[PDB]
Amino acid sequence: AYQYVNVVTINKVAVIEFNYGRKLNALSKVFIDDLMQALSDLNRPEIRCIILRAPSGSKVFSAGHDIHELPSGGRDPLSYDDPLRQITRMIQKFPKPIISMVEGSVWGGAFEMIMSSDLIIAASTSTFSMTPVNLGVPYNLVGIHNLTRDAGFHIVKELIFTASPITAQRALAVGILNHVVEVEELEDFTLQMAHHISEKAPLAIAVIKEELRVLGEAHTMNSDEFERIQGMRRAVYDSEDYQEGMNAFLEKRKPNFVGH
Amino acid sequence: AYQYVNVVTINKVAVIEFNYGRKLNALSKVFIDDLMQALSDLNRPEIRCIILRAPSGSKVFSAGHDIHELPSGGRDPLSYDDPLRQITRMIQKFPKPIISMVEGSVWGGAFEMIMSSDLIIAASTSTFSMTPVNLGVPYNLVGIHNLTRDAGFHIVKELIFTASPITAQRALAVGILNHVVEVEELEDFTLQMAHHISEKAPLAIAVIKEELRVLGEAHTMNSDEFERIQGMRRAVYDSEDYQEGMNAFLEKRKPNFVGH
Amino acid sequence: AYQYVNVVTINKVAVIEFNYGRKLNALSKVFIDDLMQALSDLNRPEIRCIILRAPSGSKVFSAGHDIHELPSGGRDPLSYDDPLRQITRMIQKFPKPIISMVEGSVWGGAFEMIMSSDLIIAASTSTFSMTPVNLGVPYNLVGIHNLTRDAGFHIVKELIFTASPITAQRALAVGILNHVVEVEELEDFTLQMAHHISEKAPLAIAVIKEELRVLGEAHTMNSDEFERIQGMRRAVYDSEDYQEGMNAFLEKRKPNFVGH
Amino acid sequence: AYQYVNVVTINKVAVIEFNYGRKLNALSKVFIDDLMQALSDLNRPEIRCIILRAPSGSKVFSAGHDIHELPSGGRDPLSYDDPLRQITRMIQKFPKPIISMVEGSVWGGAFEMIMSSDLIIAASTSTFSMTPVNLGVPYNLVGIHNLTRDAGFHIVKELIFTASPITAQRALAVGILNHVVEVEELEDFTLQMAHHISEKAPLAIAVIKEELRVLGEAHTMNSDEFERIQGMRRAVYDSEDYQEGMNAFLEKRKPNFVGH
Amino acid sequence: AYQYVNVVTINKVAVIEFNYGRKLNALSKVFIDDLMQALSDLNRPEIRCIILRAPSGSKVFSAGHDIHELPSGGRDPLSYDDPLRQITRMIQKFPKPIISMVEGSVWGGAFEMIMSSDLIIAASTSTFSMTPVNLGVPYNLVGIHNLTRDAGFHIVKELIFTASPITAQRALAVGILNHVVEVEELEDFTLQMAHHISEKAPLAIAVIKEELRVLGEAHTMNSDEFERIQGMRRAVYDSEDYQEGMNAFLEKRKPNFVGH
Amino acid sequence: AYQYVNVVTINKVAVIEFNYGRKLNALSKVFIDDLMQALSDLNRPEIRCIILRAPSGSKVFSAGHDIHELPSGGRDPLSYDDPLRQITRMIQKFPKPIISMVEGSVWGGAFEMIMSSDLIIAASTSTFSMTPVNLGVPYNLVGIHNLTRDAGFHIVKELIFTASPITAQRALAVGILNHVVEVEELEDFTLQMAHHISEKAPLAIAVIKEELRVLGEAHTMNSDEFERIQGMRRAVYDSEDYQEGMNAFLEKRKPNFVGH
Ligand SMILES: C[C@@H](C(=O)SCCNC(=O)CCNC(=O)[C@H](O)C(C)(C)COP(=O)(O)OP(=O)(O)OC[C@H]1O[C@@H](n2cnc3c(N)ncnc32)[C@H](O)[C@@H]1OP(=O)(O)O)S(=O)(=O)O
Ligand SMILES: C[C@@H](C(=O)SCCNC(=O)CCNC(=O)[C@H](O)C(C)(C)COP(=O)(O)OP(=O)(O)OC[C@H]1O[C@@H](n2cnc3c(N)ncnc32)[C@H](O)[C@@H]1OP(=O)(O)O)S(=O)(=O)O
Numbered sequence A, B, C, D, E, F: 001a002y003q004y005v006n007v008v009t010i011n012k013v014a015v016i017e018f019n020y021g022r023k024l025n026a027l028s029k030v031f032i033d034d035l036m037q038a039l040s041d042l043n044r045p046e047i048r049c050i051i052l053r054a055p056s057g058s059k060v061f062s063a064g065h066d067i068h069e070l071p072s073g074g075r076d077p078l079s080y081d082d083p084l085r086q087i088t089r090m091i092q093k094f095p096k097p098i099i100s101m102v103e104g105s106v107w108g109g110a111f112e113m114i115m116s117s118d119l120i121i122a123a124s125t126s127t128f129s130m131t132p133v134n135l136g137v138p139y140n141l142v143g144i145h146n147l148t149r150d151a152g153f154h155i156v157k158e159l160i161f162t163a164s165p166i167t168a169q170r171a172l173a174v175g176i177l178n179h180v181v182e183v184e185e186l187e188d189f190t191l192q193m194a195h196h197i198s199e200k201a202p203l204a205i206a207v208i209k210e211e212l213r214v215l216g217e218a219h220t221m222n223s224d225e226f227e228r229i230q231g232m233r234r235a236v237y238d239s240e241d242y243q244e245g246m247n248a249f250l251e252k253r254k255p256n257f258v259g260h
């Protein structure tokens, strides 16, 4: 049993359903630790396909990173062992396909999380927002890279620079989503595809997913470039704007950014 | 002049038509050797554009890799000098544009072969399937790479994990195809484009093609990562599942995959 | 303050309008030097977003590289410190979003210039052509790379190999454009998006833009590959065809290309 | 206890001594598994430095790969999970320095093994040979890479192409060894160096060792280059010469290599 | 002129002499700022070669990083804009040769500084230590890479893991130094070589130096690898050991490291 | 037979002896065409090792690139198809070991040529110098890389920045040479080593040589860094100093370089 998720397996498909709606499935450490334990427990030969979903009728799929657990005092908010960074690596390395089945609105880290999964099938009423510029967060290289494998650079830069929600219809048009269906068809459509996948060769699926993962990561740079970017990110998470971003969220007001 | 292809030259355009209908243009060594000889013979200054096609009216453009020529004995089925691996390198290195003009259904290795070409123009009734997970084949890094330059990761993973065929309409929408034409207009439309390209500067075309080839390939990794992937692939082509997939196809039954 | 551009500021948005209509905003050194000076002058904490535009009603957004300023052969026409190469690096390194607001037709180096910008919003009547194969120009690796981050390989190869114009509608479909709007709505639509972006966290925008630039450049190759390409490009700019392409344009006739 | 090694601890220094003299410490699977378990058991905070050694007075430090365990099929003798490949990775990733203390002759895979360690301290009578060209073995990329971080390319090529032994004195002159000492002083010289290291900051040692490991691995290539090398290696392990090399070694005669 | 350096120009050679003897030429910000200003001021066409030196007769060339300016309490001590990180980039990017002419003892960051220079000529009584493991410092990737281009991996690991001084004789034998001379001959030898270099083609020298700099940096890795290393570095600069190393240095006592 | 080389076969070893003493074996196009023809003619199974040599008693092993065949200004002097660039690629890709057996003085491109070979055995009276800074030549990235795999950076920079000859003794100590012998012993010492190598497994030798070549080349950079370097080289081959260097050689006088 898990406190923050509910797992149902039928035949060779496991459905991991979020159970943290009192905090709109915000990516708190306790919630992510349960999701990763549930996935680890499902890493067995008789499980062939995973679905991630919010409960039926959710208005909010996930409110993204828990803003209360973002560090304020000059620590990197997206370091390698941050729970969001851990879950995306775990999904990408997991030797089974993982389908995000989306009903409701997706925000920030949660958008990265579904982008790191293998397929996204969404309700026609679902919406998607990438939010670091609303909070002054210097999103990390790995995290940004996870957002660049589906839609083109211009579309990705519109999403990030505006932080404006896009519809499921537009997310489908630009290459982010596999399918958009009416919400009443969402479970049936997704289960049919997951059950179809689970009849295919799991060892071929596992090595092809791993090859894609390696190819997707194989954008290489020298140590000086990385260290230069890390200096840039530190200046951002050291900024008054980053403090203003978090303060504005806690005070339920609009941030006033000034460029320091 | 070739047993398994028919070549016609119209000014600066060459059309290479498959002549292997008795095996549905399966990528047999003897067929691919003739296709490569024909291309090589056309590597002449006065030829400016190639069209690859199946004969007019074909139900099957190509049934993909010849399953009777796939190694079953714990050997790599997709090594460097396998015919499919040879023809994709030749298409990509060829200093003239190669247009795949598709009528009929496209399967597995033949889908990778058209994806390796420069442009795809397809009949509205054409369909496309990527099939390794039907057979338990550990598709190789270069082969997978060749499928990732048009549609996004989520789309590619849907194609490979489901092995389900997609329509020409969907293949256009996700960026795999350039154009979708009624079958009665396919030949005329493709030849008009091939003649237009043939009026352009062939040395500029060749160097830009080669720049795109080398940029497309420039996802670099260290030796350890490659050797780790090669170890995973060998575990797959040594598996019971790989034997079962080949056997089930030849015996025309549904395979029973067990995860070893 | 500038001979070949007009700059207006509206709150935190700066609009840089071309003023070179006499040469259809061809990318002459004098024009590019003025655009770069205006952009450098606007790198200020009270400026949050830039719009690049041609004057209202323009039939031609930009006719591309000034053909009178291309070297006659034996000289690389797209060397590192060529004005087009300088402006694309400056746009990509600029720590504020740059939106290309396109009315009219876009040609050759001007197409690369808008692709190098962060967002493109276009009139429904605007058209886009990539033209090196009309002139026999061996486009450089960096320049070609700048054309590969929005649309897929097959689409980019059609654009370059045909040099045929595409509509705003098709450029939207294939991922080149962010939005297409009626020309009467273009300025208000673009200004509202720029104003919106101007309220977001500028340091988070600048570091994410830079992360995207670095990830976009991170296709790496060895020195031999680069020098092999440079040798191919030099064979093209040494060619009879290159001189013929230049001569044909100046003499207003169809080039006769022969493959040397 | 271990069947094939003896472990002694002297405060923070652990000495792992081969106990496989019957087979001249040949790198059999059972010997390497014991070595790796002994290392794993020593990965504790109270141990700060590891010495690997043969027993005092050994004429042969290690005879290299067990030739009876080399695949002579059309199978890769140095695949990712072969014991030699496993222990070099484990030595390199081990978060404490590992010092090879060499008395006796070193051969083949045993030479790669001490080269993968952090320091080599040797008796003045010790000798070193790299032997794959005596058997016709296609040594793997990672394995060769492990021989290239100490001596220069001309020296490495002499060692490999001749398979001739070099002295401790020449191995020191070309950068392979840290120190050469008279055999009576070897143990004490090596222990004092390990005790000295063990007084230093272990978390600093571990992260600098890991930084060196990843910089040492960071020679990157594309998938096509790797698969082309793999194809060449397979042609070597499928060769008559490879058979002849193995048979000649076992039958204690000179091989007759013919180049297929 | 400069508070913390003295500059003497002889024909086309400039000799930059350290004038921070109060702190044995420790790399304080005020000293490095004057060193970089003096170097910048010498970037003129009539200057062809630079010598860096301590005053004639110095016991200590440089005592390394200023320990009072190294961050405690969980900031990275070797961030991109730390003085040491700035001076090594500036030395490597300087378009003239920079010769380190060493008299006295060289410590830690000052050893990286001279290794980042083009040639090192040393007195026979000079000595060289690399000290991070004495303090528990997690030396950064760029800094470690700067130590790997002269001696082999085994030698570099001995230097770093022991933090023991080596003699000029040993530094010459392992490839760190160009020449070792008697202290009375140091100025004559160095100036003769610098004057000889100053006769040569300065633009050829500049471009070849920059080629070597780029080739030297061209060990590339993916974002995940870099972020993983950064996480490990943070765990060290967050450690109790790091605090102990700093406190022990300030209190002039032996550190007691415990591995957390 | 060849106009400009003489070939003798001794069992499985082939000796290619320069015959261009009239221009001191300067690497003229026609000399290099014969060297490459002779290597190609010896690429047969019954040849196992190549020796390159000057005739017995030569004072000059090779005077380097033919200065008369360098372009006059405004053209890359070391383009991919230059004969020096061709012969180093051919030596490095040749599937048999190539031993440079050196008697006399070695200059410039000829120093790079022997560095590109597998082993170097030299007379005790032989000397070595790298000369581009004597002439104002912007050496290319591949050519510089070929000089970095034996001696460390400081040594390579001393060699290039001074253009000063070094002795065989010093070339041995820094790792450039394999062996130094008295000139009377040179021929038979080198032949004994070639005959020894010729008894080893040639397919193993070939694949290990190719693995070393690929790993040697695997320092990767992005397109921007390469084009930046090419722009810097072009400024040097466009410079007044490049013309002064070529004219000073032609007029047998000391160049006056001014840094433009
Ligand atoms: C760092 C990355 C992140 O993921 S940061 C998190 C980004 N997420 C967001 O910006 C969405 C924030 N929340 C919202 O926009 C709205 O709460 C949400 C999604 C639209 C639904 O509105 P609603 O009216 O239905 O519910 P409420 O407005 O009352 O919010 C319910 C209570 O939960 C709170 N809440 C919401 N989201 C988060 C969150 N991500 N972390 C922490 N708390 C959150 C919200 O403040 C409200 O708090 P209380 O009023 O105290 O009960 S980054 O930005 O991508 O870089
Ligand atoms: C390794 C990669 C591969 O490409 S393996 C091959 C993947 N290809 C496929 O899965 C397509 C399998 N074939 C089919 O589904 C059906 O033949 C297809 C294509 C829908 C056509 O339907 P159909 O009912 O008309 O089929 P037929 O009557 O021709 O069936 C038997 C005759 O056609 C021939 N044929 C067909 N496909 C192949 C093939 N892939 N390899 C070798 N032969 C093939 C088959 O040999 C037989 O010819 P006969 O000798 O006259 O009986 S991978 O999968 O991408 O990893």
Ligand SMILES: C[C@@H](C(=O)SCCNC(=O)CCNC(=O)[C@H](O)C(C)(C)COP(=O)(O)OP(=O)(O)OC[C@H]1O[C@@H](n2cnc3c(N)ncnc32)[C@H](O)[C@@H]1OP(=O)(O)O)S(=O)(=O)O
Pocket: C022, C023, C024, C026, C060, C062, C063, C064, C065, C066, C067, C068, C105, C107, C108, C109, C110, C130, C131, C132, C133, C134, C135, C137, C139
């Ligand atoms: C090298 C890279 C480049 O960008 S080379 C340039 C590529 N650009 C093109 O191919 C577009 C060439 N021009 C056109 O397609 C048409 O000129 C244009 C845009 C469509 C509209 O035709 P139009 O009938 O309204 O006007 P005209 O043709 O008669 O010429 C009008 C005045 O502007 C001038 N003009 C035009 N194009 C260029 C150009 N690329 N460079 C320099 N000047 C140009 C033309 O000479 C004439 O000026 P005046 O005679 O002084 O009034 S590459 O090709 O990408 O590699």
Ligand SMILES: C[C@@H](C(=O)SCCNC(=O)CCNC(=O)[C@H](O)C(C)(C)COP(=O)(O)OP(=O)(O)OC[C@H]1O[C@@H](n2cnc3c(N)ncnc32)[C@H](O)[C@@H]1OP(=O)(O)O)S(=O)(=O)O
Pocket: D023, D024, D026, D060, D063, D064, D065, D066, D067, D068, D070, D105, D107, D108, D109, D110, D130, D131, D132, D133, D134, D135, D137, D139
């Ligand atoms: C494949 C990679 C490998 O490492 S293959 C192994 C390379 N190792 C060698 O070439 C060393 C082979 N052995 C020798 O040269 C001599 O045995 C050596 C080590 C000098 C010891 O001389 P010795 O006179 O005291 O002892 P003997 O020669 O009379 O042999 C004692 C018995 O042990 C055996 N032996 C030796 N080496 C190995 C080995 N590597 N794997 C398996 N068995 C080995 C040797 O064949 C002899 O066997 P029997 O007399 O039949 O019991 S690679 O080459 O690096 O690619």
Ligand SMILES: C[C@@H](C(=O)SCCNC(=O)CCNC(=O)[C@H](O)C(C)(C)COP(=O)(O)OP(=O)(O)OC[C@H]1O[C@@H](n2cnc3c(N)ncnc32)[C@H](O)[C@@H]1OP(=O)(O)O)S(=O)(=O)O
Pocket: E022, E023, E024, E026, E060, E063, E064, E065, E066, E067, E068, E070, E105, E107, E108, E109, E110, E130, E131, E132, E133, E135, E137, E139
């Ligand atoms: C973080 C990197 C670093 O470079 S950390 C620093 C590594 N450097 C060292 O370990 C050398 C530290 N210094 C010494 O051991 C001794 O000063 C040395 C060099 C042996 C000479 O001893 P001495 O008796 O002749 O002279 P003193 O000790 O009295 O010092 C003279 C004045 O200069 C000061 N000084 C010295 N070194 C440093 C330093 N690294 N940072 C800051 N200040 C330093 C020293 O405190 C003394 O100042 P006063 O006490 O005010 O006269 S890392 O380790 O490479 O990672």
Ligand SMILES: C[C@@H](C(=O)SCCNC(=O)CCNC(=O)[C@H](O)C(C)(C)COP(=O)(O)OP(=O)(O)OC[C@H]1O[C@@H](n2cnc3c(N)ncnc32)[C@H](O)[C@@H]1OP(=O)(O)O)S(=O)(=O)O
Pocket: F022, F023, F024, F026, F060, F063, F064, F065, F066, F067, F068, F107, F108, F109, F110, F130, F131, F132, F133, F134, F135, F137, F139
């Ligand atoms: C550009 C790349 C190159 O490789 S360019 C070539 C670099 N090589 C050199 O700098 C060596 C230049 N030559 C010399 O230093 C001397 O000729 C040398 C080799 C020490 C031999 O002196 P010597 O007095 O015995 O013979 P001479 O001076 O009288 O010359 C004999 C005739 O051949 C000529 N010669 C010499 N070297 C070259 C050369 N590299 N290319 C073309 N011609 C050369 C020399 O000019 C003389 O010609 P004549 O006076 O006309 O008979 S780079 O520099 O590496 O970047």
Ligand SMILES: [K+]
Pocket: none
């Ligand atoms: K809006």
Ligand SMILES: [K+]
Pocket: E037
């Ligand atoms: K300053």
Ligand code: NI
Pocket: A219, B219, C219
């Ligand atoms: Ni990419």
Ligand code: NI
Pocket: D219, E219, F219
């Ligand atoms: Ni390297």
